[PDB]
Amino acid sequence: MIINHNVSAIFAHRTLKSNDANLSKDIEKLSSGMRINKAGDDASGLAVSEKMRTQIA
Amino acid sequence: MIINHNVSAIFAHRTLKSNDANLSKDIEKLSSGMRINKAGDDASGLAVSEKMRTQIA
Amino acid sequence: LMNAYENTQASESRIRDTDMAEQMTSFTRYQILTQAATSMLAQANMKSQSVMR
Amino acid sequence: LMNAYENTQASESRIRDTDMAEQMTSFTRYQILTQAATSMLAQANMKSQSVMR
């Protein structure tokens, strides 16, 4: 057994961070109530919507 | 997961703080029935209304 | 003068007074939105404890 | 006087009365560290008994 390096742990920890990244965004959406909040969720979605908000204003 | 800090807690708390303050504005407006309780929200609306009230009296 | 007295007061009402029916749309809006933020506040808090296993 | 008291109450509340939502955030994480630090102190004692064979 390769005792120095734990490959199955390396696969697991990255997989854990992937679900952690997914988990943290869902908390943001529920805390705010909007699917797109910051830059990164959708480049066009934030851009297209912002025109409607000012038009509504 | 990062244990010294938690990002998900900061966003939900900050979003809560913004929502709570906006709720306070609704309470004052609903109780008194006036949309413009204080200036800054609409500085021109207050001044014109004050001019309007001057003639009305 | 009296005809203007009504018109001036009606003119002031639109800027100053608020529609109670329309306003309650927002009071309930931020009442529920406060529930989502407060209920999900502890869900993130319970997220951290899962690493102690 | 009513406006002055109401205004000063809001400002003095920020620096005197704490935010419950923020305090519970630090309280949990600070308690996670204590349970984490306790275990690392525990395994320290076992570490000293590896070369006494």
Helix (H) or strand (E) holding B8: helix B7-32
Q: How was this structure determined?
A: cryo-EM
Q: Tokens 């609409």 — which residue?
A: B42
Crossing angle of helices B7-32/D20-47, nearest 10°? 160
Question: How far is Cα A14 from Cα C21, in angstroms, rounded to an integer?
Answer: 51
The Cα of A26 is separated from the nearest Cα of chain C by a number of Å equal to: 10
Helix (H, G, I), strand (E, B) or coil at D50: coil
Resolution attained, angstroms: 3.2
For residue B34, the cross-strand partners are C17
Q: For residue A27, list chain B residues with Cβ-Cβ distance below 8 A.
A: 8, 11-12
Question: How far is Cα B17 from Cα B15, in angstroms, rounded to an integer?
Answer: 5
Residues C8, B16: C-beta atoms closer than 8 Å: no
Helix (H, G, I), strand (E, B) or coil at A33: coil
- Which chain C residue lies closest to D33 (C-alpha atoms)? C52
Q: Helix count (H) and strand count (E) of chain C?
A: 2, 0
Tell which residue, D51, A41, B43, B9, has the closest CA to residue C48: B9
Q: How many residues does chain D have?
A: 53
